[model samples]
Target chain A: MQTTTLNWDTVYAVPINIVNEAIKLKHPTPENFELLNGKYGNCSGSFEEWQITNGGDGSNIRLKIPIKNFKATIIGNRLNGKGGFAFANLEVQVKLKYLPHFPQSKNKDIELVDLKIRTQSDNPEDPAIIVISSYKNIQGFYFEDEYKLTEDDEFVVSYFYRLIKEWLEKNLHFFNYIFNTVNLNLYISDKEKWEWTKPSYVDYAYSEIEGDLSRSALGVLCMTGGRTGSKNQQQKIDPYAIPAASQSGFLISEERLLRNILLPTIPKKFPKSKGDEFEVINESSQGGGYSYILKLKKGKKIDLENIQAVGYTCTPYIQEMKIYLLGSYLKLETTTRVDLPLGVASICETTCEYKFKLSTNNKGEQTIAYEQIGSPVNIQYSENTGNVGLNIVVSFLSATLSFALTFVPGFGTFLAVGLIGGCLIGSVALIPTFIESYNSDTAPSIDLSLENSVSEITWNSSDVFNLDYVALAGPLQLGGTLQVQNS
Target chain B: KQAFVFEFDENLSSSSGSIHLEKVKQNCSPNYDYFKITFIDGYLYIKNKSGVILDKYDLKNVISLVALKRDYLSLSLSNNKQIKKFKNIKNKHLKNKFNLYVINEDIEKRITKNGILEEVILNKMLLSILLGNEENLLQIS
Candidate 1:
């Protein structure tokens, strides 16, 4: 996987400092600042997040752009069909990261302690919208709402974008940022198809973060690069091969990563049946690996055989899993949920006439031993009852495991309760017992930070269409910063 | 796959099909005074639910309309309907032609609060505007 990264000498962006603060104090007007939906006039009292006062005399001069130089480009093709957006790459750009005219306020004790940039945007009509949150200087955020491209001539829509102002407010903490910048990075999917009329399949450009944008602050962001090429094509799953090449890259919006990775893996696998329909059940615990056994109804064709493999990700914020078939297998899992004689939780000797189909094109039903993956233990239901104990300490040694075998995993999390189940000393809890036994350890070790932390997305490409094989030049940082001015 | 398109020259021929479109009505019939040619010396007319003309005129450029022809055929397998030999002509008459169409007019001098037909009328207007283009009509029809 030839995953190319962008090299940057300097990232010029607007900074939120003393100058911006001075303007907020001297002639603070509702200028370049913008209010989403315009339902409210004041950005302060309205937002629970940004409603704070500080510095000097609680002046109502918190700097804000009535409108900012912002733009959004949806470079994917899920909406129009055909191709272009391979990996949902949603990105945004702030024409100006911060107002340099604003003063800089940074001291050993007064550096930006903690700032958060919250953003949201959608298509022209908001068919699909994205919300991002950032601290420090970050290019964008990525999200994985979960989706997949079905074999049934399904439409593949990969898109990515960010909230420009919020991104800037979240990143460009100082004015030096604005002064130390050059050309912005422009990621193009196909240089071959770029044109004057349709400069962008779906795009947006703005002048100021807040304002009518009639002044010199006016900006443009709807696909307006005189140059064009396919130096930005990207292939998901595999980070190798520079396809869509154009401008180098920036922080791959964390949101984009989640959506791209999750959607394709665990797409909408809605069963044909509606109410109480068994989705997946595997009881043949023979195969040991990360996989799930889903039991569909009889004669129901499972879109699995065609699938080659599946991708599964378990993060603190989101858990995404996908199944790729060699086509679709006409087999079904007879787990406990199916309550069959031998599938899913059918123990060693459960029985039921297995008669379900897996392939859409294939016919007939098959009978097989129910296999089970993950782990399902039998609990006796523990009861505290306000400590109505006896001399023998009558505690129910029951444990309820909730994670369930829903997602096939190499390991499963087991919730156990009783007399601490451990064989050795201090292993189970002093005079302990092993209520639950297995190789599974505490899920606590999984670092909660990597769940979703996106700094910048930098994409670079070697132009395949650029006969000269021109390598994408620059990598634009989409993250910006905000400044709170005190009069 | 093109939803709509049309072209025309107001200079030469002006058959009733070329007659300026006042309004095109489908499924529902329209009244006389609605003639697009107007009192510009053209005759006005109306059509029936069956798409047959309920009335006709020989006047010149006098608020006239290309009402439903005498034949509006319907095939059993489909809801698609056509106006027999005049289908092609009607299509051309409406193709790329300039015409006025009154939407909300009621049975009385008053207008119908329910001007739902306005949308249908727009489709008809386009057809009427693109009438003369027989070649295009054949391909579409």
Candidate 2:
């Protein structure tokens, strides 16, 4: 199980409309006002209108509620002939401080302080008025009861101040309740959801995050040991090598051949130049190695005579050729037979397979291992008219002859010239000992292994063919092994 | 041992068996430089000058041969299709010589100038050869 870390920071923004709506819903009407135990009058006042002013910073704001058409009577005290009545326009002012809650928090932190109540006379000529100022401390609001007023006016002033203070306190509690109850996070989240639904806005937002998203995906890919593995599975698997193992026994279809082999191996810029002609036509994987069949195209030819080999010299007559990239070796196979002038009974057929293995030695030098397998030479004698009758003898003799040619240079040509017309010349005595030593038990077939530098060999075609050989040999040499069998 | 070689000179010849290509005389000299087509030991090879093999098709998977246009030949097989073009043919008479040789003697007539060979005829010829009926030769004269 993996643990993911989360981080967050505090952000505060006043929800302006929510706070305004909270103030308006608590209407300061005459119906909501409470009478102060018969000391006050029957107050008939119109609804109070509240206005909120926001400071530049989100934490502080002011609210003012004004009451108009105020009329109230003093019941117990009568002065002169007036019936002890007083009517005045009144207003309450409140300053609030708050901090926004988290996006997931339901509760709001708000402080209401600086409560004030102001009165004005209905008569324009009367300039006298009283102001009851109060502030919120740790406990609650404390109003100053003292005021400058006449004896009759004193009753109205005291009654009005208490009445208004109670009203302000009740409404302030309501305002705090509204702010705390309204979940600002839900509104913010809803607005964000709406913005995401807009296609234009969504596209713009995606463009902003595209590079970071791609880079994050690349990080995930690297963490999982490339794109093929899951987070839980850390082993890196080679997608190409897995299928090769499963289908080792069966022949790969042409579709798989192209998809798995050719597409991966073919150069991105094909026909790199005018001289590039050979293209891989087929591929097969067996014995933990792959073989690709290549064909030369566009009137291009390879001169085998230029290739430096130990014993075999190739004739210039080449036709119907199919080259195979078998493991680390390049197998040049031909159907046409090129005969060697050994003797009347001896004939060399070019229908054999010539395999050349290219490798890089420890000294960083490119080396080639050349071997000629299968019986390319056929020797016939009198009364042995059948081709199969001479195959056993030819196999033994061919292996021996190839081995001798590899060890002793120019041995094939010497044998051919010495045994012209089926007569051995100078080296006749040495031939019997050579044949006896090889024909002894357990030496039925020959295996010739020799390594030479790449500079010593010439393919005699364009440099493209030589590069192709090197390129094809590079990967195969890492794990390629030849399985040689003797007959 | 069965081998068939088709030269660009409109001459189709077989090595081990009897086959013939009807020569169409042209005003220009025979140009063997373009390509050579051969079927030897159940493998088809298309070669160019200096013994460069352009393509090789195994007869077992080869299903049909199509003469697409004046210079194009298409070999449709079981899993893949190969289309090759014979370029740089100077004469019109030599252009129509892109032919397929099978081991059937019945359809020895040449693929005409329009470059049309019956798909059924080529399929039957290939089927016969793949089934080991390697007696008569099928050539586009």
Candidate 3:
């Protein structure tokens, strides 16, 4: 069964109307929140847990927000089915419920948290309601107002604010309030679809426009995947379908591209038969290989030259799309690092990073890029007891002997130096003989750019997609008609 | 007598700034007509809106054609005098059910219905507004 899918994830700017409604949801009535819960019933824990909750009844630290105009956006993905995240505007009101005893003084230490975020949209109609909630490293803080008290009497209340701040940071991470309830109603038909007649046309033309990116409801997207189905049965694709590379189409970060797209899959080719000619696989099946294991130290900025890609790295704006016709094939520019085990004498040793560029047109025709016999680093490996020592000694003696002969008298020095130089220069002819000495019968070599062949894939334009705004404008009302007879 | 229809507005005639217009191709229309009319920097600008520009001429490209049957106003962008340009052009107006009326140079004198009554009013007013006697709208109107 072939699946035609568009793995996609995009961020959407939250509308002003939704932002206003979201802030109210962030700090709902303080009375409605239950602090004295049995969830963290460990009695030996910090005393703030009991003191802030007052063992059961809430404390006098009230929260009344006066002014708030929230603005933010939604971000989501549909690769492993539907899910996304919501972001609330940064900065909101947070002060002590009651003023301190020293009312004449000032309170400058106001605290602001990171933008309030949610998992899904509060409204069902808009597109921003996108993902499942999984947030990162959110911190907490405490502040005092100058119009409030700063005396020793106010000491206990400062700790009270710390407990309140802690609840705000960790508790909201539970995205249960959004995704569990609101579905964007976006459905992808992943189940294998076989057709009797012709399949109905599908319109997927909505995309990020010229001015829509900065103020976009859907921010930059990282889309991946392909539309694969029966050849006899025509398939229609949406213009906004997520694009997938000819190799692995999984939307991956910068770090995973090397291991995923290049390493194990390099020598991918049409399956060869034992005795017959090339046998082309039909639509019901696919051909590819597994990827290798390459781990990155978490939070590292960059590594291995080819590795380390940021998760959402693509700009993902609109451009022309093509559907390849049968006989269309894929070419790739790829690089690979090899491991030569079992103590074989080799050129590259341990780890050497390689870089190669793939050449192709916008129509997805890839070209095999650069190749080299030796790796970037010329690390010579020798398992013998004295091979490296001998090699170094011979090089050192040649340099010292050449220098000493320069001081020898007249023609004798010239004759000796000429002979030595001639022998050294003529050594280029012996390279083949030297290479033959390395036991190739025992040493195996890995080719980074292996010959990979693909079947002819045909594609065509999926007819015309209409922009409603352009269609509605019709003939412009600006031009007026003149009767020729009057002129 | 010659009659013509020229789209006019207070903004188009008086504005020192520019306006942009593109060719309109209606769906299921009889034929294709590509023309863009704009007023910019106190000058009326005309150009082909879509596809390649094949026929070339200046104000000489603008032809005056006669029509009395359906209260139509016609202007020619093609150099031919056969009135085929008007036929191909106004066919875009068929689908909308809105464009067959006559336009007067004076905004207050516009015909409100599927109407084209005056022979010397709108056309003459437009010519006078665009230019005086023997004066071209530009080096080539």
Candidate 4:
């Protein structure tokens, strides 16, 4: 009898509102805050949490957090010819203007500006106790007469005023710390939930004209194993049916493959990838995906004037290496079949495709290398079939890697050329290693022999066979079917 | 001397234009008991009871006006300059004092609603006269 298995997995794009909901659920607003204490006594109060809002001008946006019922109590020994205590209640509004090139810009720092603080009174008709207007770091204070007790109290009241003013000047910088503590980057990059899928690099994007973060989303380049599913019986399942509701913003899966799998496998010490290097240049709802552009920074040229390899007379130094990536979406699928008498059989395939232009300039002449196209790698294994086979079909879509080779005494220069070309194949070979590391629990051992062949021997006798033979790779096997003998 | 007197109510909401460019028997003398402001010619004068001009600022030099509260107004000047310091005055006690110009009650009411007055509202004639014809002189709260 024959048994079959199937599985499905893919990445998804999540929206900003959902991302905001997740953040709000994780971190709620605080009710009370004590900003300062000690020498001038204590300044404590309650305030609204930071929130994105529309700016006064229709074309911009800002972050606003307000404080109300704020109280600053001063303790000193100069009132009524003795030690005394005085307190003041206030209402303060703090706002931060958004930078025009926020998130994408190198400097995403925000400063608290245009601050207004007023004395709070139970009755609105009563005169204000104090009024303060501040822009950036400059502040202006206006005190009312009610704060003065008597002609003899002039020194006391002035002393109290000065204390309050000094306290404000010293402690107002705490607002900058508070504003930055819960910035937009922290909100979208939920580390707790996405710890395992942590991207090496992250960035943010939003609609600039609206002056708010309602349309904001995070861009992350991280290695992720898309959600997978499996079944014992052969059945047709929709690959696109699984909802991507958990993800935040439009995700570019190929970018993760390029950064995590391909770039790291390169032989040389390529410059580290930066978050800003990969930009979401454009998006199309019609295709249901975002287009990403990766401008891999050029590495510093190495001098090979005196260097010598074992088989070469002339040394070919790398003049320049430029890599550019343009593409989206990467998927991996595997299938396993199990039959009673025959050993287990499995096949792993990936539709992972992208275009990258590799330009290498050397000392010789600029020869356009190779532009690779849809290169798919496949792995097949069976106990009864001849041997395990790993077929890597590498087809470049107009790829280029120009090398200037300095010809010397021997023909061994072609050996260096072959080694250089071998690097590209070596880079593609890491995909299986990546997959194996990610799905180690369900993946079978793919040991490639020196002869480029893999084989699993199964005894023909029933005495040696067991029902658990199909359970070797575990229950969550990816992509295919496994068969074993039925007693 | 003929002058325009803008009288404000206790709440600074409405104004009585009773002394509109009319001849007065006595000149409007400075009142040190209350905080007073007058715009004569092109200069804004802040005076003391001794009739001494305590601080004189060219109204043209006023860069922005900030209504800190219903009873407080701050004017930011150009060239890193600041307005001269003045003694505090109780708003309720300023009632029945000699008045040539006071913040109209309607403008004060707007300050209560807006938190800060940064932009021009419907009734800006008084501010225009006091600070010159510069548009958008007020900063919105």
Off by over 4 Å in 4: A1-168, A173-244, A247-260, A263-432, A435-487, B1-56, B59-141
Residue-wise C-alpha lDDT for candidate 3, range A1-487, written one tens digit per residue = 1112222121111212222233344333222122233221101111111100000001011112111111111111100111111211111111111112222223232111112223222232111211111112212212222322222211212222222323444443432211001011112234311110011111111122224222211111112122222222211111222222111111111112222222222112112212121111112212211111222122221111111112211111101111110111111111112111221122112122222223333444432222221322222333333344555444433332232222112212222222112111222233233233322222221111111000000001011111111000000000111111211
lDDT of 2 by residue, A1-487 (tens): 1001000000011123433443455543333444344333334344454544321111112334444444444332211111212233333322222233234333332111111212222332111121222121112112222322221233333354444544454344433322221112212222122111111100000000113211110000011001121223221111121112121100112222222233323222123324344465534444322334544553554332322222445343223344444433334443222333332122222323333333443554444334445534322222223442455446434543443333222222222121110111112233333333321122211111111111111111111002112111212211121111211
TM-score of predicted structure 1:
0.18
Q: Judged by TM-score relative to the true structure, which candidate is superior, 3 or 4? A: 4
Model 4, range A257-346, lDDT digits (tens) per residue? 234333433333223323222222222222223322222234433323332222223323333222222221212121212221222222
Candidate number of the best TM-score: 4
What would the TM-scores of all predictions be? 0.18, 0.18, 0.17, 0.26
The deviation in Å at residue B12 for candidate 2 is: 99
**On residues B46-122, what C-alpha lDDT tens digit does candidate 3 reach at each position?**
11223222221122122221111111123323343432101112112122221121122212222211111121222
Displacement of the residue A162 alpha carbon in candidate 1, Å: 27
Query: 2 or 3, which is superior by lDDT?
Result: 2
- iRMSD, per candidate, in listed order: 28.0, 57.7, 33.7, 24.8
Worst 10 residues of 3 chain A by lDDT: A470-479
Chain B alone vs. reference chain B, TM-score for every model = 0.20, 0.21, 0.20, 0.20
lDDT of 4 at A78: 18
